[PDB]
Amino acid sequence: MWFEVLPGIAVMGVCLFIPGMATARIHRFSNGGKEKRVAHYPYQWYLMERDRRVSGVNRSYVSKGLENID
Amino acid sequence: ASATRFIQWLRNWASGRDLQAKLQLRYQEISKRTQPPPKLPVGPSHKLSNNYYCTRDGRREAMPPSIVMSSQKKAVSPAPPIKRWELSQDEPYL
Amino acid sequence: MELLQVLKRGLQQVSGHGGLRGYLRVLFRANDVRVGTLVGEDKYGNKYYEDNKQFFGRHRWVIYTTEMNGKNTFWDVDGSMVPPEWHRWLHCMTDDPPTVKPPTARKFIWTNHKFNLSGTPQQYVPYSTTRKKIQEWVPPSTPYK
Amino acid sequence: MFMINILMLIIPILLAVAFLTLVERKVLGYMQLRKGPNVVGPYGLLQPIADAIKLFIKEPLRPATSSASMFILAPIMALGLALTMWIPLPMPYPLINMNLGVLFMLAMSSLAVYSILWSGWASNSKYALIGALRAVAQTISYEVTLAIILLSVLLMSGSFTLSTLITTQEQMWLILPAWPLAMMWFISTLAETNRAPFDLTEGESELVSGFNVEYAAGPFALFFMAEYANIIMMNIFTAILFLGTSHNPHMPELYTINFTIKSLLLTMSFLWIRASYPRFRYDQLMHLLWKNFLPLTLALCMWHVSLPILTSGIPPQT
Amino acid sequence: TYKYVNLREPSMDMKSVTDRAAQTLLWTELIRGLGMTLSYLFREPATINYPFEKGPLSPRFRGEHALRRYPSGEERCIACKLCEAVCPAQAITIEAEPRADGSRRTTRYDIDMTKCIYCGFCQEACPVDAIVEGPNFEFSTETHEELLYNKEKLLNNGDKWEAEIAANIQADYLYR
Amino acid sequence: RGEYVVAKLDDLINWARRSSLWPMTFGLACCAVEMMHMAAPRYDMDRFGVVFRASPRQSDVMIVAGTLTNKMAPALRKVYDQMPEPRYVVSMGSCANGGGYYHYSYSVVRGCDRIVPVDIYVPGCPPTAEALLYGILQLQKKIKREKRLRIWYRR
Amino acid sequence: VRETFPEATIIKPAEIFGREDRFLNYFANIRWFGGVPLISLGKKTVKQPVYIVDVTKGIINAIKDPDARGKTFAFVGPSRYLLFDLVQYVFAVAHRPFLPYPLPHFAYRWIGRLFEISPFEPWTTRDKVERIHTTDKILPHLPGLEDLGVEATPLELKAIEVLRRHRTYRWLSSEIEDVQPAKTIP
Amino acid sequence: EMVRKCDPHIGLLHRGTEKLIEYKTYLQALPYFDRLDYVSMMCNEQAYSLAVEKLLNIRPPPRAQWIRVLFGEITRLLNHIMAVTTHALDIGAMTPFFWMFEEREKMFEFYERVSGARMHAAYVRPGGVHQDLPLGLMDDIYEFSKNFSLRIDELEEMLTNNRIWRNRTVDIGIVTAEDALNYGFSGVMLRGSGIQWDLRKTQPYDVYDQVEFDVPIGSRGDCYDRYLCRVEEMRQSIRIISQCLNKMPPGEIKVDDAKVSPPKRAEMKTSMESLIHHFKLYTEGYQVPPGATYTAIEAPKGEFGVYLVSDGSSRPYRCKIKAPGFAHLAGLDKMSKGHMLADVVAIIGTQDIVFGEVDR
Ligand SMILES: CCCCCCCCCCCCCCCCCC(=O)OC[C@H](COP(=O)(O)OCCN)OC(=O)CCCCCCCCCCCCCCCCC
Numbered sequence A: 001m002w003f004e005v006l007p008g009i010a011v012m013g014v015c016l017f018i019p020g021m022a023t024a025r026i027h028r029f030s031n032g033g034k035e036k037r038v039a040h041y042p043y044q045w046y047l048m049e050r051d052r053r054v055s056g057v058n059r060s061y062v063s064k065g066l067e068n069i070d
Numbered sequence B: 001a002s003a004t005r006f007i008q009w010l011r012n013w014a015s016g017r018d019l020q021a022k023l024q025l026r027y028q029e030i031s032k033r034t035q036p037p038p039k040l041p042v043g044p045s046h047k048l049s050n051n052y053y054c055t056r057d058g059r060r061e062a063m064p065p066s067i068v069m070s071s072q073k074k075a076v077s078p079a080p081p082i083k084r085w086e087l088s089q090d091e092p093y094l
Numbered sequence C: 001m002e003l004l005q006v007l008k009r010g011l012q013q014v015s016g017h018g019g020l021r022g023y024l025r026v027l028f029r030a031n032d033v034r035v036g037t038l039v040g041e042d043k044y045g046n047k048y049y050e051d052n053k054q055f056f057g058r059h060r061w062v063i064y065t066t067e068m069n070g071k072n073t074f075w076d077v078d079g080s081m082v083p084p085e086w087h088r089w090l091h092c093m094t095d096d097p098p099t100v101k102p103p104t105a106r107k108f109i110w111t112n113h114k115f116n117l118s119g120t121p122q123q124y125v126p127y128s129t130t131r132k133k134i135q136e137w138v139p140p141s142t143p144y145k
Numbered sequence D: 001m002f003m004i005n006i007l008m009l010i011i012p013i014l015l016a017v018a019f020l021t022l023v024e025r026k027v028l029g030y031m032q033l034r035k036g037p038n039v040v041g042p043y044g045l046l047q048p049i050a051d052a053i054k055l056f057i058k059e060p061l062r063p064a065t066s067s068a069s070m071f072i073l074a075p076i077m078a079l080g081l082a083l084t085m086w087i088p089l090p091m092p093y094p095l096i097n098m099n100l101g102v103l104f105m106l107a108m109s110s111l112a113v114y115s116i117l118w119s120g121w122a123s124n125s126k127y128a129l130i131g132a133l134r135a136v137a138q139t140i141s142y143e144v145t146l147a148i149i150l151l152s153v154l155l156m157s158g159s160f161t162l163s164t165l166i167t168t169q170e171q172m173w174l175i176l177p178a179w180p181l182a183m184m185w186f187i188s189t190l191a192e193t194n195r196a197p198f199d200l201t202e203g204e205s206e207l208v209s210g211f212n213v214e215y216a217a218g219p220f221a222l223f224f225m226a227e228y229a230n231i232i233m234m235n236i237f238t239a240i241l242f243l244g245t246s247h248n249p250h251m252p253e254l255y256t257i258n259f260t261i262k263s264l265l266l267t268m269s270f271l272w273i274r275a276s277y278p279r280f281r282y283d284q285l286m287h288l289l290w291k292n293f294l295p296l297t298l299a300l301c302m303w304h305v306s307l308p309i310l311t312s313g314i315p316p317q318t
Numbered sequence E: 001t002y003k004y005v006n007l008r009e010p011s012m013d014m015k016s017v018t019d020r021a022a023q024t025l026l027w028t029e030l031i032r033g034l035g036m037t038l039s040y041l042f043r044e045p046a047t048i049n050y051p052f053e054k055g056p057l058s059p060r061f062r063g064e065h066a067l068r069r070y071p072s073g074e075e076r077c078i079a080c081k082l083c084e085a086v087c088p089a090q091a092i093t094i095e096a097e098p099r100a101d102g103s104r105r106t107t108r109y110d111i112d113m114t115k116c117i118y119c120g121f122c123q124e125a126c127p128v129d130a131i132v133e134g135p136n137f138e139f140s141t142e143t144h145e146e147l148l149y150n151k152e153k154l155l156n157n158g159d160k161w162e163a164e165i166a167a168n169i170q171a172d173y174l175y176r
Numbered sequence F: 001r002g003e004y005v006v007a008k009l010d011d012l013i014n015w016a017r018r019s020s021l022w023p024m025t026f027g028l029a030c031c032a033v034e035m036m037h038m039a040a041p042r043y044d045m046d047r048f049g050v051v052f053r054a055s056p057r058q059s060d061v062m063i064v065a066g067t068l069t070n071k072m073a074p075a076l077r078k079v080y081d082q083m084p085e086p087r088y089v090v091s092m093g094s095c096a097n098g099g100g101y102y103h104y105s106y107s108v109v110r111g112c113d114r115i116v117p118v119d120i121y122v123p124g125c126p127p128t129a130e131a132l133l134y135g136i137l138q139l140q141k142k143i144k145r146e147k148r149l150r151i152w153y154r155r
Numbered sequence G: 001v002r003e004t005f006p007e008a009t010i011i012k013p014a015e016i017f018g019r020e021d022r023f024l025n026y027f028a029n030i031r032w033f034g035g036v037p038l039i040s041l042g043k044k045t046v047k048q049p050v051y052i053v054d055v056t057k058g059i060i061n062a063i064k065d066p067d068a069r070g071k072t073f074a075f076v077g078p079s080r081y082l083l084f085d086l087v088q089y090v091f092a093v094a095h096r097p098f099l100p101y102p103l104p105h106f107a108y109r110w111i112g113r114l115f116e117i118s119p120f121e122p123w124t125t126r127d128k129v130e131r132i133h134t135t136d137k138i139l140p141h142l143p144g145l146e147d148l149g150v151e152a153t154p155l156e157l158k159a160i161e162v163l164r165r166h167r168t169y170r171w172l173s174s175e176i177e178d179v180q181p182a183k184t185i186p
Numbered sequence H: 001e002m003v004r005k006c007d008p009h010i011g012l013l014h015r016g017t018e019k020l021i022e023y024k025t026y027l028q029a030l031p032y033f034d035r036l037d038y039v040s041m042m043c044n045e046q047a048y049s050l051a052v053e054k055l056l057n058i059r060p061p062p063r064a065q066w067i068r069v070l071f072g073e074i075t076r077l078l079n080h081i082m083a084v085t086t087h088a089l090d091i092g093a094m095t096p097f098f099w100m101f102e103e104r105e106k107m108f109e110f111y112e113r114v115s116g117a118r119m120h121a122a123y124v125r126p127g128g129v130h131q132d133l134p135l136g137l138m139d140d141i142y143e144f145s146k147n148f149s150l151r152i153d154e155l156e157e158m159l160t161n162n163r164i165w166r167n168r169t170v171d172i173g174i175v176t177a178e179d180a181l182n183y184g185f186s187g188v189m190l191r192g193s194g195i196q197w198d199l200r201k202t203q204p205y206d207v208y209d210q211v212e213f214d215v216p217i218g219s220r221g222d223c224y225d226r227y228l229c230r231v232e233e234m235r236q237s238i239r240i241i242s243q244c245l246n247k248m249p250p251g252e253i254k255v256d257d258a259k260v261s262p263p264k265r266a267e268m269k270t271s272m273e274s275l276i277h278h279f280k281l282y283t284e285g286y287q288v289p290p291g292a293t294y295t296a297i298e299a300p301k302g303e304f305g306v307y308l309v310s311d312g313s314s315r316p317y318r319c320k321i322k323a324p325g326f327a328h329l330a331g332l333d334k335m336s337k338g339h340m341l342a343d344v345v346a347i348i349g350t351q352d353i354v355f356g357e358v359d360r
């Protein structure tokens, strides 16, 4: 019957789900739990470069808040 | 025959036909695979009298061709001209 | 809702095959999990089933034995394993199974059915069944000459 | 971690491609009143694995008349570029976030055509050459209309970034205001992927196997994987373009599930279409695009330049 | 009588012309074709589960050949050679002589099953129902030689298949 | 133990090959009509993994389905040679098996096994579609019994 | 063999060339390594190769010939060649570039072991290198192919049959007479 | 891809059928006709049987004549399903082949139930048919015919109005009525171009004069019109089959004349005359009076005829088979002028060629 085509569709669906799920999870893992910073324009890259310098650990995803202003 | 009501409706709608009335899979309407014995009839030559083979011998009635001309008035055609066909009245145009 | 009834029917098939193990056995041996009425069983272990609500062609089937004539047929099965008395019913040449309409017994009919033996040491090898046509002169065994 | 991200992209792609082959055979089978694979593994689930192993232990042939280097290069190009087409796809986050992702996908699709031309030419056989020149005709037919169809859609999104399409369609699918372009886009993707009723470069009933007729075993498998990879990718592109999924930044997997379902259904429609229609003649395909889609595409490109301006609804540049 | 298959002029009124424009632009007739294949997707397939299920056959089916016996065990064949004479393929070869009890019996009865056209003429011609075509059709071999049947093979076939053959003959002999 | 490893690898390559037999789209006469019926829904050869492919480069099996004439013999041998290996030949029907009804003709090859090696002979004129399927499954079991790697290990 | 079965026919062929040989095909396959190594540049070795069909016909005649029982034959080709000239002819017939270079015996042996590592069918071996560079013995005392009625087939008439498939598309159609033969050691 | 010349090289399935027949009795030659147009098996048998029955000067009984028309029209359904769906298969529409070959499979069962063979029945013989219909067969034919028109309706849904199908077949392979006649075309190859000709109407045989049906006529003489003619001929076949089911008469099924048709097996085993005639018919065979006839039928593929020369013995002196496809294929180069490669694929299909009959 037609519903016997579903198992292959389900397997195909799972495989197509993995790349998107894996990319999202790897991004959080490599950016301290946040989305990967998107730098489409020079301004955004400038801010990211300043974040790297400001971090103190050479990681632009390590944020510094009021605790760092004296 | 085991299709649920929803599936029957779905394929009926998609095809635009009531497919359940003329299914292409066969079920119980077919003839039984065991049948009562037959009792076949005999032909017109199964008689005990007035049945001499010479009076019903097709092969011996064949004759050699009729020689019309050999090298040993109105014009004619092989047959009357063919009558023109009529349009169908069941459905003249498809 | 019918979609709920369909699941019950499919779930019933697991019990109709005597649990998940029996269900998975028929799924992997025959690729079909339908449950039918046991029409009968032949002396080699083949089991014959019918379900007359199935369409013509799918309404009779055999689950082949797992061993026949000393051969392991758990995975290797073939249509030639069906013995002649069941062959007629399985192919729908008759309505009556041999349980109901037994075949006529003869003293020369094989008691043990054989499947296709090609490619095995029991295969058939052709030969001429007639004897030598010309008898040759045999010279004498003594020197008289 | 990025190298792991790459592997978690292309290995799933190859697995999805393998099981798409099963699904097409089953879907086609049931539309043809039969079953398709249901013996090799339960419900045929192992059938793709047997086929792949079979092909890769089959003897590959290099034809005597063939140009050796080009013969080997072409299938490598086909699969390598098929995988490359996936890296900028936002699902919802792309592996490579690009400014001109659409322009990247156009260029990579144009380059992939040479894997058909060079395989056909390098084979040095008549049916292969005929198949290759059909690809020349096919590309000429759809390429101009395809780019201009994309342009019209991108005049509502405002950029060539694929992630922007997610933002554009936050409130409503783009298929609503652009269903005429979606229709012409959908047919173009069928011609782009050499799919029925535009399966002309292969054209089995006409050319035996067209461009890949001389290919066997593993090299043949590469062309097959590339084609089915492009079928899925082109239907992912379509889902992003016209059926944009909502993206919750904190639950990105909900996007992926919804977007995967849409991509699967669009892929099924490709199989559906293949079961239903006869094949175009390859001159009739050219006239379809140039005499029908292109006039309509030019007019709708004009309309979508003016419509944002006259309604004061021009999208943001950023 | 005849009918025209393709001789109709489309209506040129505004509604008809706009119906045809919608069909052209919106692909209505192509969508209708998609509906038909969709309806088939949801129909039960016609496939049977061979070899667990078999295609139907009738008692008249012409399959593998067999040489039959009387209920006593005596061979039916009396070497008349009618089957050999009628065989359209000349697939039958026969030799005969008086048996040790004086019976008229064959010493050779070969059927070249690669010559045979499975036509059933031999079983029509046989006056004693000795040679028949049985119901077996699953006897493909690995070698050509295995299909050159001699009398021993054909008698074994008869002994192997007699239970089915006799029931099939019973079902159909009143049609012969 | 190498014996155990090669035995299992034999099962895998054998399983992959018998599970994916691609016959060449190649038919000669009336036997080819029954071959069409094996692909038709009732038997659905494709459900066994058996799929026609037109190119000999992409075929594993040649089914000689019909009479082989003298004029056709070189073309049959050509396309068989162009099949990569492993390759198999199924002889279908009396004509292909040994000439059949046309055995004594001046224009017919008396069996395709004079031209190519044959793995399975399917008898009949024509064999039923089921008979042909029985022959294909018989070929599958022949491939299952192959011992390529076990013999190589003991060379 | 001559002791167990005194009446045996023992046939001693030189290197046999044919479609499926490991002789002409072996030389033609050296092309994948660029140059063609040769011990002493092949000027110290002489070969007298024999066609496969000649050996076959000689075997078949030995079966039918009563005089052949208990004898020992030597099946050699009609011509003796220098190994260098033979390989040069092989590359000319196949239209492949010929770059012979000298390799001493110890060096050739070392590479022979390199290819012996293969668990499959070794491309070459130390033993194979030795036999190819062994001079083909002259045995006037033994009967030959002419004694069994076979007329030895020159390598010049059959080399194309073996070596046509080793060419590229450019040279596939070249005819038999286009290549000039090899110097035969008179 | 423009076709500048078509040069069909045939003979690759030439098997010297016509020479082999000279070495057979008339009965032994009958199975050779199953294997000419091996999609229209029982129609080829009927043409051979009519020719022999004409030279013998005998007549088959009425019930046999109705069976022959019934299975002739079932055979036309078999042929047209194969012709239309493989034609569509070549043109790229693969799905109708599968739907309709399930119908073919059911019609194969009718062949098997009367004759024991799915294809090469050898059922229609000079004198009548071999055996009477088994009990229950006509009910099952009726059940099949009740639903078949819906199957044709589904085929037409896929193709008839499909713009892709029309693009591939409309104005492709046009043949004028004059060219069709001079080139020796017949059947749908004439009627697609408007010629009003069908041998069942104009030169009818066994009982075709007693059934009502319409001949479909084309107006443009191209592939599309020839496709519509074959589709409408299937509907008319179902219409004829309906009348054969209702008008089937009782009686014997082969000529009651045991010097031509063998006696019944029970008679053969009781009566001396019957045994002698059974013996002689299956060995020497019936002799045919000397003469020559050209007999033709409206076969599914066109006019199928035999020129049968009898020398007075029990083996034919000469049997020339006129295959409709032979003349059609000779016209392929004419019909393919100005067309492309893919159009030649369509044109081969529209001629409906089987090389069993082209080559013999
Ligand atoms: C406010 C004012 C607004 C202003 C804007 C208004 C715009 C809307 C009104 C304009 C019309 C909109 C529709 C335009 C769609 C494109 C139309 C088209 O090009 O199709 C017509 C084309 C013509 O070809 P033909 O029929 O053979 O004859 C032509 C004679 N020269 O025929 C074809 O193309 C046939 C294609 C054959 C291949 C089809 C195979 C697939 C069929 C199934 C696809 C189903 C659709 C799926 C869409 C999914 C999208 C995700």
Ligand code: SF4
Pocket (backbone or CB within 6 Å): E083, E086, E087, E088, E089, E090, E091, E092, E111, E115, E116, E117, E118, E119, E120, E121, E122, E123, E133
């Ligand atoms: S079935 Fe026909 S061809 Fe075969 S042996 Fe009998 S008479 Fe001869």
Ligand code: SF4
Pocket (backbone or CB within 6 Å): E076, E077, E078, E079, E080, E081, E082, E083, E084, E094, E122, E125, E126, E127, E128, E129, E130, E131
């Ligand atoms: S099998 Fe029958 S027909 Fe043939 S020789 Fe024996 S008795 Fe006569």
Ligand code: SF4
Pocket (backbone or CB within 6 Å): F029, F030, F031, F032, F065, F066, F067, F092, F093, F094, F095, F096, F100, F101, F124, F125, F126, F127, H035, H038
């Ligand atoms: S074996 Fe029979 S069915 Fe097959 S091609 Fe020959 S005559 Fe036709």
